[PDB]
Each structure stands twice: as C-alpha cells, then as structure tokens.
C-alpha cells in the first residue's frame, strides 16, 4: 500500500469534502476520487463517487493489512479494491450504487 497509493492518479490525500465537491462538479455518473478520512473513526479514507449528480462518501476501512468497504475485508491494498471496482459495479455493495469507478479525477493536470 501507499506508494501504490501515493501514485495513484485519484488518490488525493488530505483534501477536504468541500474541494472533492468542486472537482465532481457536474460530472458524469462514475467519476471518483480517494482522500484520507478525516478521522480514523470513519476509515482510513474516504472514496467519493458521482452518482444520479449525487456525491456518494463510501468509508474504506482498514484492519490487519487488509482493506474493504465492510467486513471481511479482503484486498491487500486500496488500488486493488479500486481496481476491482474499475472492472465491477459497485451493485455487489450496494443495490443503490450500481455504476463502476468509470471517471478518476486525476492529480496529474487531467
């Protein structure tokens, strides 16, 4: 994790909600990014999605090297719950969120 997730294009850091809104703007259903969570309470970050012009916060949770949306959580790292979410809908989540990762905003000028 994190220099997977450090280079990750749309992984931002400690950004706040305010500045993830303004770069989902009226964007298409599907575009995201990951920040850290502002409290460790919720998540070690928070990954937030655009879906019906709506700004989805989904909590990443973090526990003994694995990562998740909810327990078990099964991924070795943040990029490859994103990237599995890249290639499925989210629908295996959630019913209300079935869209996938389809847009990173990038920290690369994109």
Do not use: C
Request: charge should be neutral; aromatic fraction near 12%; glycine fraction near 6%.
């Amino acid at each position: 994790n994190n220099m997977s997730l450090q280079n990750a294009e749309w992984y931002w850091g400690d950004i706040s909600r305010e500045e993830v809104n303004e770069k989902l703007r009226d964007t298409a259903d599907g575009t995201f990014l990951v920040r850290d969570a502002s409290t460790k309470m919720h998540g070690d970050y928070t990954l937030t999605l655009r879906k019906g012009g709506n700004n989805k916060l989904i909590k990443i949770f973090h526990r003994d090297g694995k990562y998740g949306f909810s327990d078990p959580l099964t991924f070795s790292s943040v990029v490859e719950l994103i990237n599995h979410y890249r290639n499925e809908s989210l629908a295996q989540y959630n019913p209300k969120l079935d869209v996938k990762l389809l847009y990173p905003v990038s920290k690369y000028q994109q």
